[PDB]
Copies of this chain bind each other. A is one copy, B any other.
Amino acid sequence: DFSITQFVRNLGLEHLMDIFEREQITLDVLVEMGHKELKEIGINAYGHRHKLIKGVERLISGQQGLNPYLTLNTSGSGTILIDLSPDDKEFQSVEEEMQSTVREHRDGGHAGGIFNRYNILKIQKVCNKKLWERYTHRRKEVSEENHNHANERMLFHGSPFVNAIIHKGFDERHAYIGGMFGAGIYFAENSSKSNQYVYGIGGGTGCPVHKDRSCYICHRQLLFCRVTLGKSFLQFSAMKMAHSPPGHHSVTGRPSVNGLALAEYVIYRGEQAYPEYLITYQIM
């Protein structure tokens, strides 16, 4: 509460600090208060309100180059998880997407274990204001290209760094270098394809508690994400690109007889995806 104390003292309004302390008025709150709000907490004199508002203007606008607003607006940020009710139809729709896209992989369940269905434990909507705004800015940029069409999709993504993703967003600096299309973020439309990467490439060593890639006890996590594809480059064979091809925004790997068994979608910029749903589950 020191910053607001110095701000008020520099104005010669120290005698209002009792009011400010009682109402828990910190500088971050004060910079968002006009005449009405200040009157509401008992600053009855117009002169004091005028001095306070002018001082706030001088700090925020007059010193914009220092970006004092950003350092004052760190509170309230971060990610929050909102549970979906199992009876709500959005929960059921996500569950139907999760269950109905299961496929039998070419390997005999080696990478992601053996199963046919899932036991869904909970479904959470991931809300992060800054990450969502970054996603929307990039989505609008992509839609201005490609004739006002974002080519948005909802796709799956498995990764042992889901916590980092939901708290910091997708980052191409952590791209999957070994991917078939090279140094991108990979998304699948079959949830069981992405389930093979919950414990890392090729299933890793499996679950940490039992070192089992087919463990039926441990709670797994997956992300069901909004992905902006824009104008997508189709490919049937492996390529080692570091970015999207010229004039395009993503790569769509198509299934082929001698190639992919299932579809793949690759983006080369972290801001073109947003992890909307976090799904906790076990395999059967």
Q: Which residues of A contact B (CB under 8 A)?
A: 89-90, 93-94, 97, 144-149, 152, 154, 224, 226, 231, 276-277
Question: Chain A interface secondary structure, helix, strand, loop or mixed?
Answer: mixed
**Bound Cα distance A145, B97 (Å):** 12
| Contact A148 B89, beta carbon cutoff 8 Å | no
**Bound Cα distance A273, B271 (Å):** 29
CB contact between A93 and one of B93, B97, B146, B154 (< 8 Å): that residue? B146
**Bound Cα distance A231, B145 (Å):** 26
| Contact A93 B147, beta carbon cutoff 8 Å | yes
**Bound Cα distance A90, B146 (Å):** 7
**Residues of chain B within 8 A of A90, CB atoms compared:** 144, 147-148
| Contact B89 A145, beta carbon cutoff 8 Å | yes
Q: Nearest Cβ distance between residue A144 and chain B, in whole angstroms?
A: 8
**Bound Cα distance A226, B150 (Å):** 11
CB contact between A154 and one of B89, B145, B147, B226 (< 8 Å): that residue? B147
| Contact A94 B277, beta carbon cutoff 8 Å | no
Chain B, residue nearest A154 (CB): B149
**Residues of chain B within 8 A of A276, CB atoms compared:** 148
CB contact between A277 and one of B144, B147, B152 (< 8 Å): that residue? B147
**Bound Cα distance A113, B145 (Å):** 31
19 A-B pairs in the complex with CB atoms less than 8 angstroms apart: A89-B144, A89-B145, A90-B144, A90-B147, A90-B148, A93-B145, A93-B146, A93-B147, A93-B231, A94-B147, A97-B147, A147-B154, A147-B224, A147-B277, A148-B276, A149-B152, A149-B154, A149-B226, A152-B152
**Residues of chain B within 8 A of A152, CB atoms compared:** 149, 152
Chain B, residue nearest A150 (CB): B152
**Residues of chain B within 8 A of A146, CB atoms compared:** 93
Q: Nearest Cβ distance between residue A219 and chain B, in whole angstroms?
A: 21
Chain B, residue nearest A147 (CB): B93
Residue among A146, A224, A276, A277 with the most chain B CB within 10 A? A146
**Bound Cα distance A277, B154 (Å):** 26
Shortest 10 CB-CB contacts between residues of A and residues of B: A93-B147, A149-B154, A94-B147, A90-B147, A93-B146, A89-B145, A93-B145, A97-B147, A90-B148, A147-B154
Chain B, residue nearest A276 (CB): B148
**Residues of chain B within 8 A of A231, CB atoms compared:** 93
**Bound Cα distance A97, B151 (Å):** 13
**Residues of chain B within 8 A of A97, CB atoms compared:** 147
**Bound Cα distance A145, B92 (Å):** 10
Chain B, residue nearest A277 (CB): B147
Other contacts beyond A93-B147, A147-B224: 17, CB < 8 A: A89-B144, A89-B145, A90-B144, A90-B147, A90-B148, A93-B145, A93-B146, A93-B231, A94-B147, A97-B147, A147-B154, A147-B277, A148-B276, A149-B152, A149-B154, A149-B226, A152-B152
